[PDB]
Design an enzyme around this catalytic site. Structure first.
Site, PDB file in Angstrom:
ATOM      1  N   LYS B  38      13.287  -0.178   1.478  1.00 40.78           N
ATOM      2  CA  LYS B  38      11.883  -0.206   1.044  1.00 40.78           C
ATOM      3  C   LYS B  38      11.557  -1.418   0.162  1.00 40.78           C
ATOM      4  CE  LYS B  38       8.183   2.715  -0.997  1.00 40.78           C
ATOM      5  NZ  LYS B  38       7.194   3.106   0.047  1.00 40.78           N
ATOM      6  N   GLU B  87      -1.791 -13.664 -18.946  1.00 43.34           N
ATOM      7  CA  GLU B  87      -2.600 -12.446 -18.963  1.00 43.34           C
ATOM      8  C   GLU B  87      -1.911 -11.332 -19.779  1.00 43.34           C
ATOM      9  OE1 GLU B  87      -2.278  -9.587 -15.665  1.00 43.34           O
ATOM     10  OE2 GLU B  87      -1.967 -11.327 -14.376  1.00 43.34           O
ATOM     11  N   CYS B 121      -3.217 -13.973 -12.714  1.00 40.29           N
ATOM     12  CA  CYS B 121      -2.143 -14.838 -12.238  1.00 40.29           C
ATOM     13  C   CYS B 121      -2.574 -16.330 -12.174  1.00 40.29           C
ATOM     14  CB  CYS B 121      -1.411 -14.332 -11.002  1.00 40.29           C
ATOM     15  SG  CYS B 121      -0.746 -12.656 -11.271  1.00 40.29           S
ATOM     16  N   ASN B 159       4.522   2.689  -6.649  1.00 43.74           N
ATOM     17  CA  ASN B 159       4.839   1.651  -5.667  1.00 43.74           C
ATOM     18  C   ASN B 159       4.631   0.208  -6.146  1.00 43.74           C
ATOM     19  OD1 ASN B 159       5.680   3.633  -3.854  1.00 43.74           O
ATOM     20  ND2 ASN B 159       3.958   3.427  -2.415  1.00 43.74           N
ATOM     21  N   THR B 163       7.384  -4.438  -8.250  1.00 38.39           N
ATOM     22  CA  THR B 163       6.800  -5.782  -8.102  1.00 38.39           C
ATOM     23  C   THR B 163       6.446  -6.439  -9.437  1.00 38.39           C
ATOM     24  OG1 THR B 163       4.453  -5.128  -7.794  1.00 38.39           O
ATOM     25  CG2 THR B 163       5.902  -5.071  -5.806  1.00 38.39           C
ATOM     26  N   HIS B 256       1.608 -18.385  -5.106  1.00 33.47           N
ATOM     27  CA  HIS B 256       1.771 -17.274  -6.027  1.00 33.47           C
ATOM     28  C   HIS B 256       2.497 -16.179  -5.262  1.00 33.47           C
ATOM     29  CE1 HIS B 256       1.294 -14.151  -8.893  1.00 33.47           C
ATOM     30  NE2 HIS B 256       0.543 -13.429  -8.083  1.00 33.47           N
ATOM     31  N   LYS B 261       7.521 -10.672   0.713  1.00 33.93           N
ATOM     32  CA  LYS B 261       6.896 -10.263   1.983  1.00 33.93           C
ATOM     33  C   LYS B 261       5.476 -10.793   2.108  1.00 33.93           C
ATOM     34  CE  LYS B 261       8.238  -7.762   4.901  1.00 33.93           C
ATOM     35  NZ  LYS B 261       8.002  -6.308   5.050  1.00 33.93           N
ATOM     36  N   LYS B 265       3.814 -13.280   4.961  1.00 31.74           N
ATOM     37  CA  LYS B 265       2.555 -12.958   5.626  1.00 31.74           C
ATOM     38  C   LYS B 265       1.529 -14.072   5.421  1.00 31.74           C
ATOM     39  CE  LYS B 265       2.982  -7.887   5.505  1.00 31.74           C
ATOM     40  NZ  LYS B 265       2.102  -6.699   5.782  1.00 31.74           N
ATOM     41  N   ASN B 335       7.863 -10.947 -10.001  1.00 30.75           N
ATOM     42  CA  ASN B 335       6.564 -11.541 -10.222  1.00 30.75           C
ATOM     43  C   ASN B 335       6.405 -11.953 -11.692  1.00 30.75           C
ATOM     44  OD1 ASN B 335       3.835 -12.239 -10.274  1.00 30.75           O
ATOM     45  ND2 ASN B 335       3.099 -10.285  -9.465  1.00 30.75           N
TER      46      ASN B 335
HETATM   47  C1  LIG Z   1       2.085  -4.599  -2.807  1.00 29.34           C
HETATM   48  C2  LIG Z   1       1.864  -3.078  -2.870  1.00 29.34           C
HETATM   49  C3  LIG Z   1       0.408  -2.773  -2.489  1.00 29.34           C
HETATM   50  C4  LIG Z   1       2.795  -2.409  -1.844  1.00 29.34           C
HETATM   51  O1  LIG Z   1       2.957  -0.994  -2.093  1.00 29.34           O
HETATM   52  P1  LIG Z   1       2.896   0.071  -0.824  1.00 29.34           P
HETATM   53  O2  LIG Z   1       2.027  -0.492   0.250  1.00 29.34           O
HETATM   54  O3  LIG Z   1       2.635   1.448  -1.302  1.00 29.34           O
HETATM   55  O4  LIG Z   1       4.433   0.026  -0.309  1.00 29.34           O
HETATM   56  P2  LIG Z   1       4.801   0.349   1.265  1.00 29.34           P
HETATM   57  O5  LIG Z   1       6.237   0.751   1.262  1.00 29.34           O
HETATM   58  O6  LIG Z   1       3.759   1.203   1.890  1.00 29.34           O
HETATM   59  O7  LIG Z   1       4.632  -1.013   2.077  1.00 29.34           O
HETATM   60  C5  LIG Z   1       5.303  -2.202   1.662  1.00 29.34           C
HETATM   61  C6  LIG Z   1       6.198  -2.744   2.777  1.00 29.34           C
HETATM   62  O8  LIG Z   1       7.409  -1.971   2.849  1.00 29.34           O
HETATM   63  C7  LIG Z   1       7.630  -1.686   4.275  1.00 29.34           C
HETATM   64  N1  LIG Z   1       8.609  -0.596   4.226  1.00 29.34           N
HETATM   65  C8  LIG Z   1       8.404   0.659   3.786  1.00 29.34           C
HETATM   66  N2  LIG Z   1       9.557   1.340   3.863  1.00 29.34           N
HETATM   67  C9  LIG Z   1      10.492   0.510   4.338  1.00 29.34           C
HETATM   68  C10 LIG Z   1      11.846   0.647   4.623  1.00 29.34           C
HETATM   69  N3  LIG Z   1      12.458   1.809   4.408  1.00 29.34           N
HETATM   70  N4  LIG Z   1      12.525  -0.419   5.099  1.00 29.34           N
HETATM   71  C11 LIG Z   1      11.915  -1.582   5.303  1.00 29.34           C
HETATM   72  N5  LIG Z   1      10.613  -1.750   5.044  1.00 29.34           N
HETATM   73  C12 LIG Z   1       9.890  -0.724   4.564  1.00 29.34           C
HETATM   74  C13 LIG Z   1       6.238  -1.371   4.741  1.00 29.34           C
HETATM   75  O9  LIG Z   1       6.208  -1.354   6.169  1.00 29.34           O
HETATM   76  C14 LIG Z   1       5.525  -2.597   4.146  1.00 29.34           C
HETATM   77  O10 LIG Z   1       5.851  -3.796   4.850  1.00 29.34           O
HETATM   78  P3  LIG Z   1       4.968  -4.308   6.077  1.00 29.34           P
HETATM   79  O11 LIG Z   1       3.435  -4.499   5.570  1.00 29.34           O
HETATM   80  O12 LIG Z   1       5.680  -5.742   6.347  1.00 29.34           O
HETATM   81  O13 LIG Z   1       5.022  -3.378   7.255  1.00 29.34           O
HETATM   82  C15 LIG Z   1       2.203  -2.503  -4.263  1.00 29.34           C
HETATM   83  O14 LIG Z   1       3.575  -2.756  -4.563  1.00 29.34           O
HETATM   84  C16 LIG Z   1       1.286  -3.045  -5.385  1.00 29.34           C
HETATM   85  O15 LIG Z   1       0.199  -2.504  -5.611  1.00 29.34           O
HETATM   86  N6  LIG Z   1       1.746  -4.093  -6.086  1.00 29.34           N
HETATM   87  C17 LIG Z   1       0.938  -4.679  -7.162  1.00 29.34           C
HETATM   88  C18 LIG Z   1      -0.208  -5.518  -6.598  1.00 29.34           C
HETATM   89  C19 LIG Z   1       0.282  -6.793  -5.887  1.00 29.34           C
HETATM   90  O16 LIG Z   1       1.333  -7.344  -6.222  1.00 29.34           O
HETATM   91  N7  LIG Z   1      -0.539  -7.196  -4.915  1.00 29.34           N
HETATM   92  C20 LIG Z   1      -0.337  -8.376  -4.066  1.00 29.34           C
HETATM   93  C21 LIG Z   1      -1.615  -9.213  -4.085  1.00 29.34           C
HETATM   94  S1  LIG Z   1      -1.891 -10.005  -5.721  1.00 29.34           S
END
Ligand SMILES: CC(C)(COP(=O)(O)OP(=O)(O)OC[C@H]1O[C@@H](n2cnc3c(N)ncnc32)[C@H](O)[C@@H]1OP(=O)(O)O)[C@@H](O)C(=O)NCCC(=O)NCCS
Ligand SMILES: CC(C)(COP(=O)(O)OP(=O)(O)OC[C@H]1O[C@@H](n2cnc3c(N)ncnc32)[C@H](O)[C@@H]1OP(=O)(O)O)[C@@H](O)C(=O)NCCC(=O)NCCS
Lengths: 462, 462
Positions: B38, B87, B121, B159, B163, B256, B261, B265, B335
């Site tokens: 994950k 920040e 950021c 979640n 990060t 940034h 991942k 993207k 981060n």
């Molecule tokens: C970034 C953020 C939204 C992700 O949390 P989330 O979506 O609940 O986490 P998820 O597990 O659903 O998804 C994250 C990734 O893990 C993948 N994943 C989940 N379980 C997995 C596993 N067992 N093995 C491999 N990958 C896995 C998901 O598929 C996804 O990747 P993908 O989009 O490439 O398919 C969250 O960590 C967050 O809010 N962070 C703070 C804000 C941030 O940093 N935002 C970025 C823009 S500034």
């Protein structure tokens, strides 16, 4: 080098905003049960502006921005830099600047450099300098810079409460301006100090070390004035002028104004600087009667009442000519924090004609606790003709006193309850303000609601 | 325009600081009871740095500044601008910059423009731009600008917590640099968004709308890249060059990095932009097999997994060449908020020789929620010779991986308790940190005490 000379980068427009109600200081004396004169003479304060629950840092800044743009018939596509100086922090990551982008959405102009910048009362000046630097840089794209300084100054109950206030100033900055930054003359001083600071996240109020704040303000003034003088002396010497800079080289001298009395003390402090720096003190009629102080040191005299009394008396006429008029907004509204010194600038522009301002040097001392300070200067253009830039900027402010007098006085008990409720509402979400919309000045943005996720919505009072 | 051409304003030194402990993401997966991969695959994260009670925003910034000054054998008199992007706010009035003046007291150099600047950021980049603008202005006095980006990134349980991270980067900026800001190429976009913001003053943690945060990042990337491309096209056309900008015009492309991942993207997102902008898509071999997506719109594809899969695959070689190496610090530390993108810059400098960098364009995407973003670029000098400035700056970072590997892993339960105690200590006054001084890296400034008046005192670990 000749590039910068052509530009005449300066303040092209100045817009000021303050709320429509104040508490009267003589009434506040009665309410606080203090001796008559403690606020009106002691602090030198007549009226203190305050906000109802309908206004916050975002609404103040939106209000002054839109009022400037409309007054000046400006398109939102003509702004290339937008930045906010403030110390009124209601979000630790999301800048006021990003909130202000709401106003720019319809134009599609989103390529606008700048965010927010904070150090106590000094953030407005920091933004000003950033704007000037940007216009002079390789990144300027021909558009104006817009600086907004805004704040809500509130203190806990006690001897600092009468020294609050609230307001915002917007400054449009660009080339060929009527008020021109004098290039290379920033006398800056920064220092690690705990005179005034806001580490308590549970309260809107600062921790204030009152006596230390006065000492820091005055020592900063000493240092900034000396750096400013060193810089101007070096320019003059290149041009074959070996004279020393004195107060008589300022036509006007304006200050960050925590309260008027300190500003009167500060001008007197500048005279003391002039006095000590002149090796021919005892043959200059300006310093007659001050011979007993010839040997004193700046660092020993921050609270010396004999030096103070003598130099306040000796600088009374210099104070009246250079500084008193600039205190209109401070005396009638209080301390606007980052915008205070710009309120003093506005006060000069409101009360003097273009002819009275033409060619003059305006000295500017900007202070912020913690501490950061700069003494810098503006040069007023020689063009005082009708329709000139100088005529437009003075005409834009000549009703300032009338605007101030159009506000409504509110009784101290009502003011006190407003303050108490503000404390109690400070962390609250999922609320709708209950303050009057109708009592706001025409064109004022106000808070509509704060939702369950702390998001704020605004609307404009027509 | 020949004044700015001569200057070659850029980054002359780059210092990075991170704490000496991390939590391992594979162990954190087991601790949180989530499925294997994950964090390490899903987010693409290996280790997350964190602080004990001995470090705060002030200590992080003091550390990186003094480390830079010592590495580079610099007098404190040679800094003319010093500003902090962050920040991590522990005082609403008093800037980190004023705290940093502790380090400059001995020299007596207090005439140093700049304070703090904040939007999520993005504040580091804001300060970088302020520094560049200053060097290019009438106010430059021959001295260096010094920019510090620093933060402690912590999330509530859930979640977002994997990060977080922590660190600081100092950038020394001046003329005739080995990494030169490409003039006139700032593709900026700002917008009023509530994707991530910190309005809760009772908690160190942000309000995050996770999905909205990814969408805002991606829409901002689209817009910034478009503006950047428009600006460089006009520049090239004035020079006689009518070609379209594509990703192949970047030798390196850094971002940034909230987590790796999203950066993968994001490069794929940039290739999708190239694809849609190219009128001869179907004839160019990089786009082979993507014909099914020829008619898609950017605003409809933020979470389209088919588009994502296809363009991630198609951009895999570009990612490896231009971006993968840049993610060393992100992958190994998490981060760092304002310093994250400068950590990615450090990572490129750490892993490529002068010869491999010489003459290349480094694209830089800086984002802060709320939101403010700029895509800009750097040009590396062609001088890769032995003893060159490019030799010097790369040599200052080529031990970066070994520095990261010298840190100590701490078990997830210990990490968890650290976080819990941090929450509990967040508003506390009159306390003395209990964390180890000996475990800090050599030369690290640390918190000694917070007194009864919230005043913080610091000392340096030898
Ligand atoms: C970034 C953020 C939204 C992700 O949390 P989330 O979506 O609940 O986490 P998820 O597990 O659903 O998804 C994250 C990734 O893990 C993948 N994943 C989940 N379980 C997995 C596993 N067992 N093995 C491999 N990958 C896995 C998901 O598929 C996804 O990747 P993908 O989009 O490439 O398919 C969250 O960590 C967050 O809010 N962070 C703070 C804000 C941030 O940093 N935002 C970025 C823009 S500034
Ligand atoms: C400025 C501050 C320290 C003053 O509080 P204080 O010193 O306790 O208030 P005091 O009433 O004791 O004294 C203030 C003035 O009133 C005078 N005074 C007191 N009663 C008076 C009266 N009845 N009539 C006339 N004057 C009176 C005092 O003599 C003094 O003036 P002086 O220095 O010219 O003699 C307080 O308002 C504060 O902390 N403000 C916020 C911080 C600030 O504004 N700092 C400025 C630097 S940034």
């Amino acid at each position: 080098n000749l590039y910068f000379q052509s530009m005449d980068v300066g303040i092209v427009a100045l817009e000021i905003y303050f709320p429509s109600q104040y508490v009267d200081q003589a009434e506040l004396e009665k309410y606080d049960g203090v001796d008559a004169g403690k606020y009106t003479i002691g602090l030198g304060q007549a009226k203190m502006g305050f906000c109802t629950d309908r206004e916050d840092i975002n609404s103040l800044c939106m209000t002054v921005v839109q009022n400037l743009m409309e007054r000046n018939n400006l398109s939102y596509d003509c702004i290339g830099r937008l930045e906010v100086g403030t110390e009124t922090i209601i979000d630790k990551s999301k800048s006021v600047k990003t909130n202000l982008m709401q106003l720019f959405e319809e134009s599609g102009n989103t390529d606008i450099e700048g965010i927010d910048t904070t150090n106590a009362c000094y953030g407005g000046t920091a933004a000003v300098f950033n704007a000037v630097n940007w216009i002079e840089s390789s990144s300027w794209d021909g558009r104006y810079a817009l600086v907004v300084a805004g704040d809500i100054a509130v203190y806990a109950t006690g001897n600092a409460r009468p020294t609050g206030g609230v307001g915002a100033v917007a400054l449009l900055i660009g080339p060929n301006a009527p008020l021109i930054f004098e290039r290379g003359l920033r006398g800056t001083h920064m220092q690690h100090a705990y005179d005034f600071y806001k580490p308590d996240m549970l309260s809107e109020y600062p921790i204030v070390d009152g006596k230390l704040s006065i000492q820091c303000y005055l020592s900063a003034l000493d240092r900034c004035y000396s750096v400013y003088c060193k810089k101007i002396h070096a320019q003059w010497q290149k041009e074959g002028n070996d004279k020393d800079f004195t107060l008589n080289d300022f036509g006007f001298m304006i200050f960050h104004s925590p309260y008027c009395k300190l500003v009167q003390k500060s001008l007197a402090r500048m005279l003391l600087n002039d006095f000590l720096n002149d090796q021919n003190r005892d043959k200059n009629s300006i310093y007659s009667g001050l011979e007993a102080f010839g040997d004193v040191k700046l660092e020993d005299t921050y609270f010396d009442r004999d030096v103070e009394k003598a130099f306040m008396k000796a600088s009374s006429e210099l104070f009246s000519q250079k500084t008193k008029a600039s205190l209109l907004v401070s005396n009638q509204n209080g301390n606007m924090y980052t915008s205070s010194v710009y309120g003093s600038l506005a006060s000069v522009l409101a009360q003097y004609s273009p002819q009275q301002l033409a060619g003059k040097r305006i000295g500017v001392f900007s202070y912020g606790s913690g501490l950061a300070a700069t003494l810098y200067s503006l040069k007023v253009t020689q063009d005082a003709t009708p329709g000139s830039a100088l005529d437009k900027i003075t005409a834009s402010l000549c009703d300032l006193k009338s605007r101030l007098d159009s506000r409504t006085g509110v009784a101290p008990d009502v003011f006190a309850e407003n303050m108490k409720l503000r404390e109690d509402t400070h962390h609250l979400v999922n609320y709708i303000p209950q303050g009057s919309i109708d009592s706001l000045f025409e064109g004022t943005w106000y808070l509509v609601r704060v939702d369950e996720k702390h998001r704020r919505t605004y609307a404009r009072r027509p």
